[PDB]
Write an enzyme that holds these catalytic residues in place. Structure first.
Site, mmCIF file in Angstrom:
data_model
loop_
_atom_site.group_PDB
_atom_site.id
_atom_site.type_symbol
_atom_site.label_atom_id
_atom_site.label_comp_id
_atom_site.label_asym_id
_atom_site.label_seq_id
_atom_site.Cartn_x
_atom_site.Cartn_y
_atom_site.Cartn_z
ATOM 1 N N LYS A 343 -1.346 -2.536 -3.242
ATOM 2 C CA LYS A 343 -0.185 -2.046 -2.512
ATOM 3 C C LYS A 343 0.943 -3.069 -2.459
ATOM 4 C CE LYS A 343 -2.842 -1.207 1.027
ATOM 5 N NZ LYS A 343 -3.996 -1.573 0.164
ATOM 6 N N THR A 344 0.606 -4.360 -2.411
ATOM 7 C CA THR A 344 1.636 -5.394 -2.340
ATOM 8 C C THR A 344 2.430 -5.484 -3.639
ATOM 9 O OG1 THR A 344 0.653 -6.785 -0.620
ATOM 10 C CG2 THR A 344 1.944 -7.885 -2.334
ATOM 11 N N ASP A 397 4.678 -7.593 4.751
ATOM 12 C CA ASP A 397 3.590 -7.659 3.780
ATOM 13 C C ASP A 397 2.366 -6.884 4.249
ATOM 14 O OD1 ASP A 397 1.940 -8.291 1.684
ATOM 15 O OD2 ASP A 397 2.458 -10.423 1.668
ATOM 16 N N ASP A 398 1.876 -7.183 5.450
ATOM 17 C CA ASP A 398 0.652 -6.581 5.968
ATOM 18 C C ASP A 398 0.802 -6.392 7.470
ATOM 19 O OD1 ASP A 398 -1.849 -5.488 6.057
ATOM 20 O OD2 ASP A 398 -2.850 -7.161 5.050
ATOM 21 N N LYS A 425 14.408 0.364 14.724
ATOM 22 C CA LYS A 425 15.380 1.406 15.056
ATOM 23 C C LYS A 425 16.682 0.800 15.564
ATOM 24 C CE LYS A 425 12.994 3.718 18.140
ATOM 25 N NZ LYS A 425 11.861 2.800 18.432
ATOM 26 N N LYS A 502 -8.002 -4.283 -8.337
ATOM 27 C CA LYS A 502 -8.282 -5.703 -8.142
ATOM 28 C C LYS A 502 -9.779 -5.980 -8.228
ATOM 29 C CE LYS A 502 -7.647 -9.140 -4.452
ATOM 30 N NZ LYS A 502 -7.033 -9.287 -3.100
HETATM 31 N N1 ATP Z 1 -0.861 -0.741 -11.617
HETATM 32 C C1 ATP Z 1 -1.129 -1.768 -10.804
HETATM 33 N N2 ATP Z 1 -0.872 -1.630 -9.485
HETATM 34 C C2 ATP Z 1 -1.137 -2.652 -8.667
HETATM 35 N N3 ATP Z 1 -1.642 -3.851 -8.963
HETATM 36 C C3 ATP Z 1 -1.886 -3.961 -10.272
HETATM 37 C C4 ATP Z 1 -1.666 -2.994 -11.240
HETATM 38 N N4 ATP Z 1 -2.038 -3.461 -12.492
HETATM 39 C C5 ATP Z 1 -2.465 -4.676 -12.255
HETATM 40 N N5 ATP Z 1 -2.403 -5.045 -10.937
HETATM 41 C C6 ATP Z 1 -2.806 -6.323 -10.366
HETATM 42 O O1 ATP Z 1 -3.567 -6.033 -9.213
HETATM 43 C C7 ATP Z 1 -3.351 -7.052 -8.210
HETATM 44 C C8 ATP Z 1 -2.776 -6.358 -7.006
HETATM 45 O O2 ATP Z 1 -3.625 -6.637 -5.874
HETATM 46 P P1 ATP Z 1 -3.029 -6.763 -4.418
HETATM 47 O O3 ATP Z 1 -2.903 -8.172 -3.994
HETATM 48 O O4 ATP Z 1 -1.730 -5.964 -4.378
HETATM 49 O O5 ATP Z 1 -4.066 -5.981 -3.523
HETATM 50 P P2 ATP Z 1 -4.058 -5.273 -2.099
HETATM 51 O O6 ATP Z 1 -4.652 -3.922 -2.130
HETATM 52 O O7 ATP Z 1 -2.629 -5.359 -1.569
HETATM 53 O O8 ATP Z 1 -4.924 -6.271 -1.238
HETATM 54 P P3 ATP Z 1 -5.424 -6.460 0.256
HETATM 55 O O9 ATP Z 1 -5.579 -5.033 0.787
HETATM 56 O O10 ATP Z 1 -6.684 -7.254 0.290
HETATM 57 O O11 ATP Z 1 -4.247 -7.133 0.971
HETATM 58 C C9 ATP Z 1 -2.332 -8.005 -8.835
HETATM 59 O O12 ATP Z 1 -3.097 -8.913 -9.616
HETATM 60 C C10 ATP Z 1 -1.615 -7.102 -9.834
HETATM 61 O O13 ATP Z 1 -1.233 -7.933 -10.921
HETATM 62 MG MG MG Z 2 -2.539 -5.994 0.934
#
Ligand code: ATP
Ligand code: MG
Ligand code: ADP
Ligand code: MG
EC number: 3.6.4.6
Lengths: 534, 107
Positions: A343-344, A397-398, A425, A502
């Site tokens: 999601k990030t 971010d979170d 708001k 991931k």
């Molecule tokens: N289509 C894609 N969408 C998202 N991330 C991708 C994609 N392809 C590759 N990635 C890789 O996946 C990882 C994204 O993981 P991310 O840190 O966003 O996880 P997260 O779900 O936000 O984590 P958490 O919930 O633990 O905070 C990065 O390494 C990004 O390069």
């Molecule tokens: Mg996250």
């Protein structure tokens, strides 16, 4: 007379500020240019101060010194704010008293014929019984700002002073310091737009043009359209860095190569040094920070299927709506999904593809060990900074970690929640836009805390849900040599696959730690073990 | 003459347009003193700061022969959150006491 009626402010100093001068002189100091006889006949008193606020390092003190000089005044007596403060009892006020002495004596011996004295302050907000309202215990006496007021306008009157004060935060200025008869004219010094970034650059590089040290290659219009939201000090630093890098390049090159003296004397800086320093040396404060993206989008973005395009298109539509519409200058959105679904990275990509001037990311990685009040202060500061540009984009971010949510209890911090709920708001000052993007993994909790009623939309980030999508992702990621991939395709035809991207990267990397024989079986076993379904 | 203090409460569903109507009713009165006390400018304040701010804004209205004060989003002033519940007792007490204090004679 003190100055010609039309004044003059250019080529000697101040750069992009020309309307400011005319405004301030027409509003306040009109009583010192009219013929003295009529001024005396009318019987009017002159203003006794002004206030200037704005970003830091945007060219405020220069204007103060220029306005002091152009009135035919004595040398300014500068002083810094936090410096006049002592732990001893009754010593932070003697410092204030010790600045009006010479004016007092000159008015004593010569009455109604003295000159003017300018007592320019700096960070005037340090001495104020108003910073204590914000959470904490800093009372700053509240006697200090009762010894300054009693000197400007007390039982004894002074008529040969002019107090100019400057501050960065206009919202902590005590209210008793802005009534008529005291500091009573406000004014704003904003960031410089295109014409200002042209004039300042022209001013700061005239010397090197005079001796033809600069090469004909470099232009200034090109460099006046790339620097977006630069403040003047940043432009000066850019010029200095360009000079230094060109100097180092020339010395190194002429030393390594025994060039003839012709080019050895010549110290042309060219344009390559300018771009190198601009892209590698200077980091703006109110502009895009192109370095931190590489710490979030670590492995690019892969297109394993359909959902990615939908998410990106929705982000584009929201960006377009916020850019070119009125009656709705604030827009929000929320991305949610299962953990480890990426999601990030999508949020960072959506923010980056907007080409906005001001982009900021507020994540909890830089608040380890912070008390909650510190978190509130940091969030408020980031939003305040975002309010000072025509277009902006702030990412959170979170949201579940900012609140310190823990399923047991439940427990969390109320102050951060309330601050966020209020800040979601609040429209910016007139004529400015904004865009906010959230992120979280527990939609139901936010729904329960009455927080999903403040956001304006929602987007779903789905997970890998079928064998074909997994196969396509593996193919594009380029592993398993395409022959074990046939066996993988045979094995994963069940279509009951529920895994995150991931976690998929982690599993592939872990499975790649054996010999070519047991790799496939190890990977299949790991996938099967973690094969939990909705 | 026998009722120198009045109060009214506007209530309804969210996103219904309550603040706008309150402001429009206030502006159409031709009173000489008109203030607004919203939580939009108290971000990060502690409870005691909120109490002092409200008390200050109320004190002035006793120094004018007419006035009309507005309190906005009472829910956010008390820091309400359905989980728990939780809120600030001190602000609630200050409000409950200030809602029933007549101004000095005449006003
Ligand atoms: N289509 C894609 N969408 C998202 N991330 C991708 C994609 N392809 C590759 N990635 C890789 O996946 C990882 C994204 O993981 P991310 O840190 O966003 O996880 P997260 O779900 O936000 O984590 P958490 O919930 O633990 O905070 C990065 O390494 C990004 O390069
Ligand atoms: Mg996250
Ligand atoms: N409009 C401008 N034109 C040229 N130089 C400027 C301008 N504004 C700021 N500067 C540069 O910034 C420096 C002064 O910064 P200053 O305005 O004193 O910061 P602060 O507002 O924090 O006191 C000077 O070195 C000056 O060259
Ligand atoms: Mg409202």
């Amino acid at each position: 007379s003190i100055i010609n009626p039309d004044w003059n402010f250019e080529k000697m100093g101040i750069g992009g500020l020309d309307k400011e001068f005319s405004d301030i002189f027409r509003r306040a100091f009109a009583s010192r240019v009219f013929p003295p006889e009529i001024v005396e006949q009318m019987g009017c008193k002159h203003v006794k101060g002004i206030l200037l606020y704005g970003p830091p390092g945007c060219g405020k003190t220069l204007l103060a010194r220029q306005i002091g000089k152009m009135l035919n005044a004595r040398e300014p007596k500068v002083v810094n704010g936090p410096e006049i403060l002592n732990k001893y009892v009754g010593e932070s006020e003697a410092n204030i008293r010790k600045l009006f002495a010479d004016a007092e004596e000159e008015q004593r011996r010569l009455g109604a014929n003295s000159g003017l004295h300018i007592i320019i302050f700096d960070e005037i907000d340090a001495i104020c019984k108003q910073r204590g309202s914000m959470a904490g215990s800093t009372g700053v006496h509240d006697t200090v700002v009762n010894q300054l007021l009693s000197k400007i306008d007390g039982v004894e009157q002074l008529n040969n002073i002019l107090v100019i004060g400057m501050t960065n935060r206009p919202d902590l200025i005590d209210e008793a310091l802005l009534r008529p008869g005291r500091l009573e004219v406000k004014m704003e010094i904003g960031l410089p737009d295109e014409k200002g970034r042209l004039q300042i650059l022209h001013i700061h590089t005239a010397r090197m043009r005079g001796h033809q040290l600069l090469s004909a290659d470099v232009d200034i219009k090109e460099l006046a359209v790339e620097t977006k939201n630069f403040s003047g000090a940043e432009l000066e630093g850019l010029v200095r860095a360009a000079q230094s890098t060109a100097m180092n390049r020339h010395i190194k090159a002429s030393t390594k190569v025994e060039v003839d003296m012709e080019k050895a004397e010549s110290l042309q800086v060219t344009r390559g040094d300018f771009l190198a320093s601009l892209e590698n040396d200077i980091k703006p404060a109110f502009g895009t920070n192109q370095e931190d993206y590489a710490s979030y989008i670590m492995n690019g973005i892969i297109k394993w299927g359909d959902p990615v395009t939908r998410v990106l298109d929705d982000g584009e539509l929201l960006v377009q709506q916020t850019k070119n519409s009125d009656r709705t200058p604030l827009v929000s959105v929320l991305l949610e999904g299962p953990p480890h679904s990426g999601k990030t990275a999508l949020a960072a990509k959506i923010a980056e593809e907007s080409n906005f001037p001001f982009i900021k990311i507020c994540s909890p990685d830089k608040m380890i060990g912070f008390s909650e009040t510190a978190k509130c202060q940091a969030m408020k500061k980031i939003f305040d900074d975002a309010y000072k540009s025509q277009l902006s984009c702030v990412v959170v971010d979170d949201i579940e970690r900012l609140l310190d949510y823990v399923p047991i209890g439940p427990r969390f911090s109320n102050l951060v929640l309330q601050a966020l709920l209020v800040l979601l708001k609040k429209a910016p000052p007139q004529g400015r836009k904004l865009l906010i993007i959230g992120t979280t993994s527990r939609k139901d909790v936010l729904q329960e805390m009455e927080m999903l009623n403040a956001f304006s939309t929602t987007i779903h980030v789905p997970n890998i849900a079928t064998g074909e999508q997994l196969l396509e992702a593996l193919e594009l990621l380029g592993n398993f040599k395409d022959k074990e991939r046939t066996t993988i395709a045979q094995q994963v035809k069940g279509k009951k696959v529920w895994i995150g991207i991931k976690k998929l990267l982690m599993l592939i990397e872990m499975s790649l730690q054996m010999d070519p024989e047991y790799r496939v079986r190890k990977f299949l076993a790991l996938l099967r073990e973690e094969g939990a379904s909705p």
